[PDB]
Ligand binder design. Structure first.
Ligand code: ZN
Length: 52
């Protein structure tokens, strides 16, 4: 495969290669379901704001 290809986050749509957030199991462009094969880093958050 590719040596050191971490790149940006999110799973690249297996159809439109649309780097979709690691929290969105679906696509936005071709709304093509997320490829189960892919792997998401458990214990992940949308990085929401805090401190009111
Ligand atoms: Zn897509």
């Amino acid at each position: 495969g590719s040596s050191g290809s971490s790149g940006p986050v999110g799973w690249q749509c297996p159809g439109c290669t649309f780097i979709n957030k690691p929290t969105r199991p679906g696509c936005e462009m071709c709304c093509r379901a997320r490829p189960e094969a892919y792997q998401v880093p458990a214990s992940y958050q949308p990085s929401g704001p805090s401190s009111g």
